[PDB]
Write a protein that binds this DNA or RNA. Structure first.
Length: 439
RNA sequence: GGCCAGGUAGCUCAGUUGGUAGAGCACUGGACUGAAAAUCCAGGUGUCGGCGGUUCGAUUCCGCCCCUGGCCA
């Protein structure tokens, strides 16, 4: 332990007004962390507490006070979730028990993954003596995220990704012992539950420096052990894997710059699609950039490798428990991923016509901007000539402007609607349709 | 409380733009054989989990709930 507006939160008062006299409560986890790091409070607040009283009644009355929902789940801990559009509050209360309070505190802290997460403070001193037996402060000053002990990483293998994510997110450098431990057994990641790996994988794709972490998870073979399919890109010598990596990185450089490639109506709904509740479609675009060609080593002489791509992606989505909607998204993104290049190649000959455009926007109108961005970043990774790229953005311009404006007996009904739609581009018309269909 | 997948005949499983719910096995009958196994032919009235919406028409499209399981880093 080393030496209120610095560690204040509005709701803390409420907790103290719930928490009984005899029992004591400590604030642990990422709150004290992010605060020490001096990063400002976001729109999503997550606070983990350690209390000596019954966390369930605590959480029930707390939630009753702030008008939050109540939660109990597996030790056995209690949650309170209060969610309105601008902000989200997750409070997780955890039990603490012992004949010696300080001893048990230190004993809990020491079991934690990283010194940056083991720093804790007493509730009373919030409303400035801190508890950091791992000495998290010292590392946080050096700007280094260092695991407490390797045994606690091995305990819950999924933490091995956290160490990457956190270090990228909070922008810190992992220590040597972490990277050494990953070099030892990169396969350990498979021992942890699947949806955790998925969820962490997405939490890494979320940020815009993600290409460096994905390269990292590749280079230690962790991204291989999770998804062996990525390991198979190297079995074909053009380099395919480096290609997918730089395509990813360029997809981030383009996505940040997205306003100046795509139109406004194409940016309108972009980013607005939700999957797994905290993640948008941008991460799906980054995934479909990683898998953009997953099928090339499967089929070569690469004729079918796009559909093969779709099938492999889909298998990865089923396996890793992604959304069926999201995995279908990524799979369709890898399926049509080569479409704008054929449209550009058709445009360079001036052979692109209303048919190709109408097909384009009927077949896939929703993945269009993602498809365009991905095609532009893949063109930038392939190192296309400037003229070729200019032609590409011009093609995109053509399609965009086409959609912009120029786009505004069971069998019998089907052909009736189809021919009515062809005519829109009258009982006598219906009778004539019937005569044309019957004859 | 959040996300995700399953719910279909007695059991267990197909059904990617919507167009009268099938297949295999099991069960029964018959042909065959001294007998049997084997082989061959024949037999689905299923409130597609429930209530609603869009369509001429919903297992599939959309909304709201029940139940089962997985996860909550």
């Amino acid at each position: 332990x080393x030496x209120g507006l610095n560690f204040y939160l509005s709701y803390f008062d409420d907790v103290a007004k719930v928490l009984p006299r005899e029992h004591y409560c400590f604030i642990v986890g990422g709150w004290v962390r992010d605060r020490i790091l001096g990063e400002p409070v976001g729109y999503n607040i997550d606070v983990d507490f350690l209390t000596t009283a019954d966390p369930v009644e605590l959480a029930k009355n707390f939630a009753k006070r702030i008008g939050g929902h109540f939660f109990v789940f597996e030790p056995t801990i209690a949650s309170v979730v209060l969610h309105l559009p601008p902000y989200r509050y997750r409070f997780d209360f955890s039990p603490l028990k012992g004949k010696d309070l300080e001893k048990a505190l230190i004993e809990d802290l020491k079991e934690r993954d990283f010194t940056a997460n083991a720093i804790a403070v007493n509730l009373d001193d919030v409303l400035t003596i801190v508890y950091d037996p791992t000495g998290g402060i010292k590392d946080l000053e050096q700007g280094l995220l260092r695991p407490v002990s390797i045994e606690n990483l091995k305990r819950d293998p999924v933490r091995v990704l956290r160490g990457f994510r956190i270090a990228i997110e909070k922008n810190l450098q992992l220590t040597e012992d972490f990277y050494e431990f990953v070099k030892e057994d990169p396969r350990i990641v498979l021992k942890s539950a699947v949806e955790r790996i998925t969820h962490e994988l997405f939490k890494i794709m979320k940020e815009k420096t993600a290409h460096k972490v994905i390269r990292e998870l590749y280079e230690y073979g962790v991204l291989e052990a999770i998804i062996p399919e990525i390991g198979r890109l190297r079995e074909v010598k053009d380099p395919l894997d480096e290609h997918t990596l730089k395509t990813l990185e360029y997809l981030e450089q383009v996505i940040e710059d997205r306003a100046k490639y795509l139109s406004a109506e194409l940016l309108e709904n972009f980013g607005k699609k939700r999957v797994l509740g905290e993640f948008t479609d941008v991460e799906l675009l980054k995934w479909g950039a990683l898998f953009h060609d997953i099928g090339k080593p499967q089929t070569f002489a690469f004729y079918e490798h796009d559909k093969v791509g779709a099938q492999i992606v889909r298998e990865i989505g089923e396996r890793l428990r992604w959304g069926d909607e999201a995995t279908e998204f990524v799979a369709k993104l890898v399926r049509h991923h080569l479409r704008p290049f054929f449209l550009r190649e058709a445009f360079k000959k001036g052979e692109l016509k209303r048919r190709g455009m109408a097909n384009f926007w009927r077949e896939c109108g929703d993945i269009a901007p993602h498809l365009f961005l991905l095609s532009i970043a893949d063109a930038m990774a392939s190192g296309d000539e400037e003229e070729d790229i200019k032609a590409l953005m011009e093609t995109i311009a053509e399609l965009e402007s086409f959609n912009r404006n120029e786009m505004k007996x069971x069998x019998x009904x089907x052909x009736x609607x189809x021919x009515x739609x062809x005519x829109x581009x009258x009982x006598x018309x219906x009778x004539x349709x019937x005569x044309x269909x019957x004859x």
